[PDB]
Amino acid sequence: GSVEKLTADAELQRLKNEAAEEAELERLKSERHDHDKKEAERKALEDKLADY
């Protein structure tokens, strides 16, 4: 047992910072890229099948 105890204490702080991980998902939503895909759904009615 020595000052090394404080070193392991740093890992405990990271666990309490797990909350920030959820905020990461919100950042992806800012892209709006996934939302843009919804408009493409309307084009699906055309059945152009340009892909193949």
Instruction: Residue 40: name the closest of 51, 29, 27, 26 by CA.
Output: 51
Experimental method: NMR
3-state secondary structure of 52: coil
Question: Which are the contacts of 28, defined by CB distance < 8 A and separation ≥ 6?
Answer: 34
End-to-end CA distance of the chain: 68
CA distances 32 to 18, 20, 24, 51, Å, are 25, 21, 14, 24
Could you tell me the CA-to-CA distances from 34 to 9, 10, 27, 31, 51 in Å, in that order? 40, 37, 12, 8, 20
Give the span between the Cα atoms of 36 and 45, in whole angstroms.
16
